[PDB]
């Protein structure tokens, strides 16, 4: 169904939000490892 | 290092300090669930 409301917006927000935190976290990790780490 | 008996728990000890931050973030999950009413 194209039916809106089927997945509550708060769950979408929480999960997308954690997705962002994870991706950004990986990018910070990368600042200390491999290329760009100074090491 | 922690006393060696507790060593198995090192990876958990490493994440603990961030938990208080997850509480602030939790306030927002919650508020989104009561529609920021």
């Amino acid at each position: 169904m194209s039916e809106g409301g089927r997945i509550p917006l708060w769950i979408v927000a929480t999960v997308a939000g954690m997705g962002v935190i994870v991706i950004v976290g990986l990018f910070f990790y990368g600042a200390y490892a491999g290329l760009g780490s100074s090491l | 290092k922690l006393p060696e008996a507790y060593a198995i728990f090192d990876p958990l000890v490493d994440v603990l300090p961030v938990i208080p931050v997850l509480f602030l973030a939790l306030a927002f999950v919650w508020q989104a669930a009561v529609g920021f009413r």
Partner: peptide, 28 residues
Amino acid sequence: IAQLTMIAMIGIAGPMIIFLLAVRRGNL
């Protein structure tokens, strides 16, 4: 892996409480 698993478990817990209470019309 051990660190990322603790993290995912501990992190899931907060949203789990909200999700559980929401599901059972709790006092949110």
